[PDB]
């Protein structure tokens with residue numbers, strides 16, 4: 008148990024002894040992000056802004072996850088309208104931990120993406136370049152095949168959709184065998200865009216870590232020793248998935264993931280070939296020029312191969328459930344504007360089809376899915392889970408709804424082009440029926456339309472007939488738009 012640890016520490020002893028205090032402080036910052044002091048945050052707020060924060064329904068937002076929602080209440084004591092939300096978009100930018108590994112994962116290593124303040128962007132960059140320079144010693148040719156390294160991971164880090172149901176709801180000690188097969192099916196390779204922190208000895212799983220990686224390094228894999236029996240691995244490494252089994256440890260069930268480090272360029276080649284194949288297949292099915300590049304794989308993180316494989320399934324569901332003529336007409340419009348279907352595992356603000364048109368960082372959006380009219384692109388984020396979405400296919404269809412909204416309004420007036428949902432016809436329909444469908448449907452006309460569009464093309468035909476019944480004018484309006492497009 009401790010012999011492996013002693014030999015690893017020995018191998019890196021000179022490297023460790025050689026670390027400056029600055030180098031040590033940096034490794035520490037990497038392991039422990041610097042959290043915002045709830046103290047400081049309030050002292051920067053004005054009187055009217057403090058008042059607005061206290062009187063704001065904190066847990067009732069869209070943009071705030073459990074981390075930021077909780078942090079905001081934490082000083083709600085210590086102290087929704089459009090005003091409240093414009094405020095919250097700005098405030099969200101000032102409460103992010105300084106977190107080097109999170110910056111690397113969010114950007115997929117593309118750290119110059121204009122998704123954070125330039126000054127902090129350069130700080131991250133310096134820290135990352137300095138850590139890279141620290142990690143120069145390889146594990147070597149005598150140790151690499153004699154040791155295993157381990158990482159406990161939350162299933163939600165890879166797929167939040169499947170992670171909702173990975174644990175047997177009847178018996179939490181068991182893994183749902185069916186969901187396991189779907190997690191495993193298309194899981195052949197993995198990318199680490201940040202620095203993996205791994206244990207020399209397998210650690211008992213703590214709360215919400217049902218994935219237990221066992222990893223074999225390559226001789227060239229650079230790493231550094233961390234106190235208490237850990238390694239930090241260089242960033243940008245490829246991992247080939249060798250085996251995925253259900254195992255039992257202390258009368259509970261876990262998923263063992265065996266992986267082998269390989270050159271990242273090997274994985275990136277696989278991803279690029281796959282991007283070629285899916286474009287060729289779909290250019291044909293859509294009747295587009297053979298060389299059209301419509302589908303982008305922007306893939307950099309640990310569930311890489313599944314982002315790739317699920318795009319196929321998402322586009323099949325797309326084609327199965329939407330009229331062929333509608334798909335061809337709208338997609339041609341998108342390609343006319345140099346549009347893309349972007350399937351990605353980095354956050355959407357770090358996607359150029361969004362940030363190229365959204366200079367203000369407080370206006371950048373991360374979410375399961377996005378449609379960006381300025382670049383005619385649909386963005387779909389693999390790892391996350393959309394509220395009130397059952398799967399990614401449905402998310403895509405919603406975003407394509409936004410594209411339908413775009414194109415039909417263009418056809419109305421093609422010199423100066425607006426969204427159909429901005430026409431006074433739809434606006435009136437929306438103030439009547441806008442509350443009759445989904446909760447998120449209520450947000451505005453664009454979302455109501457896209458939601459109605461999604462529901463109208465559910466595989467569940469109960470959900471379809473509910474639109475017809477509960478929102479007959481919306482239902483009617485959309486079929487009209489669809490007809491109008493197909494006939495153009």
Ligand SMILES: Cc1cc(S(=O)(=O)N(Cc2cccc(CN)c2)[C@H](C)C(=O)NO)ccc1F
Pocket residue numbers: 069070372373374375376377378392393394395396401402403405406409447454461
């Ligand atoms: C129902 C549904 C929801 C989404 S979504 O990706 O979750 N979403 C809305 C949203 C909701 C809650 C929290 C956030 C921020 N975390 C964002 C975004 C903005 C959207 O409308 N894109 O077009 C996507 C497709 C869908 F069909």
Ligand SMILES: [Zn+2]
Pocket residue numbers: 405406409453454457
């Ligand atoms: Zn939307």
